[PDB]
Design an enzyme around this catalytic site. Sequence first.
Site, PDB file in Angstrom:
ATOM      1  N   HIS A 230      21.307 -46.225 -11.302  1.00 57.53           N
ATOM      2  CA  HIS A 230      20.137 -46.901 -11.658  1.00 57.53           C
ATOM      3  C   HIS A 230      19.010 -46.273 -12.412  1.00 57.53           C
ATOM      4  CE1 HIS A 230      17.048 -46.037  -8.423  1.00 57.53           C
ATOM      5  NE2 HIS A 230      18.378 -45.044  -8.315  1.00 57.53           N
TER       6      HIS A 230
ATOM      7  N   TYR B 115       9.379 -54.528  -3.469  1.00 59.02           N
ATOM      8  CA  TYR B 115       9.749 -55.128  -4.554  1.00 59.02           C
ATOM      9  C   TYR B 115      11.109 -55.908  -4.256  1.00 59.02           C
ATOM     10  CZ  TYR B 115      12.334 -51.193  -5.838  1.00 59.02           C
ATOM     11  OH  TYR B 115      13.361 -50.040  -5.880  1.00 59.02           O
TER      12      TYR B 115
ATOM     13  N   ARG C  16      20.531 -37.689   5.326  1.00 60.13           N
ATOM     14  CA  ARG C  16      19.568 -37.155   4.189  1.00 60.13           C
ATOM     15  C   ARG C  16      18.667 -38.261   4.106  1.00 60.13           C
ATOM     16  NH1 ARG C  16      18.516 -38.187  -1.951  1.00 60.13           N
ATOM     17  NH2 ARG C  16      17.275 -36.548  -2.301  1.00 60.13           N
TER      18      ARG C  16
ATOM     19  N   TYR D 279      19.478 -42.205   4.407  1.00 63.68           N
ATOM     20  CA  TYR D 279      20.956 -42.368   4.066  1.00 63.68           C
ATOM     21  C   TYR D 279      21.917 -41.976   5.256  1.00 63.68           C
ATOM     22  CZ  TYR D 279      19.374 -42.589  -0.601  1.00 63.68           C
ATOM     23  OH  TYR D 279      18.494 -43.158  -1.883  1.00 63.68           O
TER      24      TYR D 279
ATOM     25  N   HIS E 299      20.287 -42.623 -12.932  1.00 62.05           N
ATOM     26  CA  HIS E 299      20.759 -41.550 -12.039  1.00 62.05           C
ATOM     27  C   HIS E 299      21.420 -42.264 -10.812  1.00 62.05           C
ATOM     28  CE1 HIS E 299      16.597 -42.714 -10.980  1.00 62.05           C
ATOM     29  NE2 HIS E 299      17.128 -42.507  -9.722  1.00 62.05           N
TER      30      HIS E 299
ATOM     31  N   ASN F   5      13.905 -43.696   1.910  1.00 61.60           N
ATOM     32  CA  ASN F   5      15.087 -43.961   1.915  1.00 61.60           C
ATOM     33  C   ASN F   5      16.082 -43.171   3.057  1.00 61.60           C
ATOM     34  OD1 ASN F   5      15.074 -45.991  -0.242  1.00 61.60           O
ATOM     35  ND2 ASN F   5      15.404 -44.312  -1.793  1.00 61.60           N
TER      36      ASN F   5
END
Length: 211
Positions: free
Chosen positions: A122, A64, A195, A113, A184, A111
């Site tokens: 968000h 998205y 991570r 990081y 969160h 994701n």
Amino acid sequence: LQKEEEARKVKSGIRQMRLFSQDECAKIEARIDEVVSRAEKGLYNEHTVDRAPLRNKYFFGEGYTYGPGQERLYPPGDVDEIPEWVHQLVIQKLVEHRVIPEGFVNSAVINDYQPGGCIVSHVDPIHIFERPIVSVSFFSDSALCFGCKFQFKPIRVSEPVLSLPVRRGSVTVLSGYAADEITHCIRPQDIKERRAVIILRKTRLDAPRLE
């Protein structure tokens, strides 16, 4: 009393379990590195990979775009398919242990990081995804914060409503209040080393979608 009231509600929408062994995590981490390497070889569709300064996002199955709250799914088949290793090392384990049903997951997002990376306040986009949202943590331990006004009004409030440890090999299941009624985020301070997370979700049949 309002913040201590919220925390219990948040906890009603969280279930966590340690499902992946250290050996299982290591194999999955090698596969995540393969994805990162394939991306750097230009092997993925443009909408599959979103590079940003301290986080890369990889969209498999569905992806998205992200005025405000007007995220839209890409057309079906625009992003790359969920890798076989995600299905067989990750989704299968979740289905076996009854976390979600066979056939629920059609979106897997990875994701990755950097140290110092973060998530700014968000809500998981409720017009795009069903609940529950399933998150699986790799490489290192971190913390997921709920109630993130402290990121924007520091003089007025300095702490989250709740801080939830998210350890390597842990599965976090968000529903109800935790998914829909509170923001969160992740504080830079809680990502001291690399991570990564795999987010397993089901898109809504009626989700708004670009043509």
